[PDB]
Paper text:
Here, we identify and characterize a unique GlcN kinase from the soil bacterium Streptacidiphilus jiangxiensis, closely related to Streptomyces spp., the classical antibiotic producers. In contrast, from 20 sugars and 4 aminoglycoside antibiotics tested, SjGlcNK only phosphorylated specifically GlcN and displayed vestigial activity with glucose using ATP as a phosphate donor. Determination of the Michaelis constants (Km) for glucose and GlcN suggested that SjGlcNK is better described as a GlcN kinase (EC 2.7.1.8) with a strong preference for using GlcN (Km = 8 ± 1 mM) over glucose (Km > 100 mM) as the substrate. In addition, the structural and biochemical characterization of SjGlcNK provides new insights into the role of these unique GlcN kinases as the missing link for the incorporation of environmental GlcN to the metabolism of GlcNAc in bacteria, an important intermediate in peptidoglycan biosynthesis, glycolysis, and secondary metabolite production.
The crystal structure of SjGlcNK was solved at 1.98-Å resolution and reveals a typical eukaryotic protein kinase fold, consisting of an N-lobe (formed by an N-terminal cap and an intermediate subdomain) and a C-lobe separated by a linker, with a relative arrangement that results in an overall bean shape. The important conserved catalytic motifs, the DFD loop and the catalytic loop, are located in an acidic groove between the two lobes, whereas the P-loop is in the vicinity of this patch. Structural differences between SjGlcNK and mycobacterial maltokinases are mainly found in the N-terminal cap subdomain. The SjGlcNK N-terminal cap is composed of three long antiparallel β-strands (βA-βB-βC) forming a curved β-sheet enclosing α-helices α1 and α2 and by an additional β-strand (βD) perpendicular to strand βB on its concave surface. The intermediate subdomain of SjGlcNK, which is composed of a six-stranded β-sheet (βF-βG-βH-βJ-βI-βE) flanked by two α-helical segments (α3 and α4), is almost identical to that of mycobacterial maltokinases, with a root mean square deviation (RMSD) of 1.7 Å for 80 aligned Cα atoms. A seven-residue linker (residues 187 to 193) connects the intermediate subdomain to the C-terminal lobe (residues 194 to 438), which is composed of two central 4-helical bundles (α5-α6-α10-α11 and α7-α8-α12-α13) and a small two-stranded β-sheet (βK-βL), with an additional helix α9, also present in MtMak, preceding βK and downstream of the catalytic loop. SjGlcNK was crystallized in two different monoclinic (P21) crystal forms, A and B, which differ considerably in the dimensions of the respective unit cells. In consequence, there are two SjGlcNK molecules in the asymmetric unit (AU) of crystal form A, while four monomers are found in the larger AU of crystal form B. In contrast to the structural conservation of the individual subdomains, the relative positions of the N- and C-lobes are strikingly different in the six molecules.
Author numbering: 1 to 89, 95 to 118, 122 to 436
Amino acid sequence: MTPNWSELVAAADPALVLPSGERRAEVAVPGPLRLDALLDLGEGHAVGVVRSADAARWTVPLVRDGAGGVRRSRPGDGTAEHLVAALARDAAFVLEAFTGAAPVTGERGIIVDESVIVGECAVVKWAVRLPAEGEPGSPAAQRIAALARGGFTEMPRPWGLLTLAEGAQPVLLASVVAYLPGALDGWDWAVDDVRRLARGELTMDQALLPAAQLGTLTARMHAALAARGRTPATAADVAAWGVRMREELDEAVASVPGAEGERLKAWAPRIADVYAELDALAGTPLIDVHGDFHVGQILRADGRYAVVDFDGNPVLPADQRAARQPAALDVVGMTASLDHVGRVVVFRTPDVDPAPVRAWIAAAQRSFLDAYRTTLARLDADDLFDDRLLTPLRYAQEVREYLYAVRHLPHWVYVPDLSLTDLLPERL
Ligand SMILES: [Cl-]
Ligand SMILES: [Cl-]
Ligand SMILES: [Mg+2]
Ligand SMILES: [Mg+2]
Ligand SMILES: [Mg+2]
Ligand SMILES: [Mg+2]
Ligand SMILES: [Mg+2]
């Protein structure tokens, strides 16, 4: 008889677990492989949770093939199709389907960051590397499900989620969401809006509306996420925040060159002064947040806004990205991002008049916060936002931009330099 899935995986080349296939033999995945869990999708298709001999765990879309026995599914094999069908139609797994899932067919691969377009209307995203058993990984499945359950719709419509039932949070193995082919992210559309403002093709009112819509979206998002509950920050939590933020400040002060570096070195005492007041913020509410929130995570098409990318903050250790944080963290991420959009327009656009752009920077931050506060109040969710955190967390956001610059793009130091120039009290 044909072996079971376990015997096929144990006998398969260890490169089975790799999306891009076998690599150089000198650094091959160590075998033998072991199948820890298997969701049978029918007709020779499956989702495996596979362990390599180094204890690393993997999500593997599998297909039985008479050529080699088993191999990793490729776009066009139909495994993503079969996952979608299992949504429309083993205790280790949780398959959650949402309204709108349909058994669409036809697969096309696309390169992101593995993602497979199905029926030219849905996107299946396979997790690849998983955390160790019982350890936290990406919270994207918990975020998307909480949003859908809360009636939040300003995101690609969820079709389904496949998770492994273990640990504090179910481990994400695959997500299926609506495909938005004609959608750009904010680093395209927000820059274009403000550029058009600078050219006089939009009025200030027109160029400010997206900032208000973003504020409403963020408030709707937080209200839905907060329905899963909240956790008061402890004294140790806020103390840890200050240590981390001061260390990042010290690194930026030690690495930023030139005039920007001199001004930052002169500003560091005041920034540190503000970080010091975090000790009085013990008890501030922590909720499930987006955690990596900025205009690049917002798709816009035909006046519809959609937030994506719920894996968490990529600079935190992988096992901390699911942790709850202050809602104000997302708030400052977006308001900082809006400021930066304005800085980029001025820096990149020939013959631009910075006066209207800088007026827009200030007015856009006010438009966002007003809409955010008004929407939270309309949703009776006012108390998740502790605005005492605005200044310390915003400063820390700008310091992160210095570190990005010195590590990846040196000239980018102008963004936090000009942002902080306008943020800091002009009394110093
Ligand atoms: Cl500027
Ligand atoms: Cl730039
Ligand atoms: Mg072989
Ligand atoms: Mg090999
Ligand atoms: Mg080796
Ligand atoms: Mg993103
Ligand atoms: Mg991400």
